[PDB]
Structure formats: C-alpha cells, structure tokens
C-alpha cells in the first residue's frame, strides 16, 4: 500500500534489484553454465507473501 514501513519498503527494494537479467559477459566465463536468471519474478504470476 502507500502506507509503508521502512522495513517493508527496504525489503521490497532488495527484491526489486534482484529482479534483473544476467550480464551477457557472464556467458563468456571459462567454466560458466548459467544461461539465464532462473530466479526471475513477476508481480502477477508469483507473490512475495509480505
């Protein structure tokens, strides 16, 4: 809601920054296996619970 606590607004912000695609140079690392960020989230498909 608009009425927010500092702790909640801060927890939300960390969830905002984690929600981004991987750097593309990560693909060129020597032993790399990751193809995409498999921990992506959508505000509608899956909910944070808090």
């Amino acid at each position: 809601s608009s009425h927010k606590t500092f702790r909640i607004k801060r927890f939300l912000a960390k969830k905002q920054k984690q929600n981004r695609p991987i750097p593309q140079w990560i693909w060129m690392k020597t032993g790399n296996k990751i193809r995409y960020n498999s921990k992506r989230r959508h505000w509608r498909r899956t909910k944070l619970g808090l």
């Binding site: 500092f6 607004k9 801060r10 939300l12 912000a13 960390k14 905002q16 920054k17």
Partner: protein, 52 residues
Amino acid sequence: NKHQIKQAVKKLYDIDVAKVNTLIRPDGEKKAYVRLAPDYDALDVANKIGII
C-alpha cells in the same frame, strides 16, 4: 539526516544551502534535493563538481 547532509554539502563544496529535501527511492537509495542559497548559482556549482 537533513542536518548532516547540509553540513556535508557546505563543507565539501564551500557553498551555502537554503534547504534540504529528502526522499528514499524505491530501490532503497536516499536522494537529497539540496537548494543552494540565492547568491550561489547551481549551474555554476555543478561545473565545479563536474556534474555538467
């Protein structure tokens, strides 16, 4: 806080401050809207700071 920010901006850049407004951004960073005294030209001061 606004007091510390005012004291920081003055000391770092030897300028004067009229008021400091602050909001915490959705990504968790705090943004300060520092209005300088009327005799300080913010566009001039920005050149000193290298902003522009």
